[PDB]
Design a protein around this ligand. Structure first.
Ligand SMILES: C=CC[C@]1(C(C)C)C(=O)NC(=O)N(Cc2ccc(OC)cc2)C1=O
Length: 133
């Protein structure tokens, strides 16, 4: 019953400062424009110890499967090759991505009927709000 309140199919309903987050990450102009238009669905499931997070959009479809605390390699939607570790910290999924001596952290938390995604690169935060599909 690890992550029960996260499981399901979620749709993006609002975003703030995502262009600036992507700039801070190093995403180029054309990818920022197309990625910024997307309205992804996030599909989260659990089977034993394995959590799967899929994102489906008109930009890119991605999927990661992982065990909490256990590093894995990830190719991100913007085509970075990163090493990722996801943990549960006080009920928040905390996803750290490392590449090229850089780091970004993505936090996913349940707040009311929303799943709130906070993405941080250095001093820049973007907040993306999802609702059940
Ligand atoms: C539904 C997924 C969740 C999440 C979130 C940002 C981590 C999101 O809400 N929206 C997305 O587009 N992506 C994809 C993404 C990630 C990084 C990019 O450039 C740095 C560009 C596009 C995601 O991975």
């Amino acid at each position: 019953h690890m992550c029960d309140a996260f499981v399901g199919t979620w749709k993006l309903v609002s975003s703030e400062n995502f262009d600036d987050y992507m700039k801070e990450v190093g995403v180029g102009f054309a990818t920022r424009k197309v990625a910024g238009m997307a309205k992804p669905n996030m599909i989260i499931s659990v089977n034993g110890d394995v959590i799967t997070i899929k994102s489906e959009s008109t930009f890119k479809n991605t999927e990661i499967s992982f065990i909490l605390g256990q590093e894995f390699d990830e190719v991100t939607a913007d085509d970075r090759k990163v090493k990722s570790t996801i943990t549960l910290d006080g009920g928040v999924l905390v996803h750290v991505q490392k590449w090229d001596g850089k780091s970004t952290t993505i936090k996913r938390k349940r707040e009311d009927d929303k799943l709130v995604v906070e993405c941080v690169m250095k001093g820049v935060t973007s907040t993306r709000v999802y609702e059940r599909a």
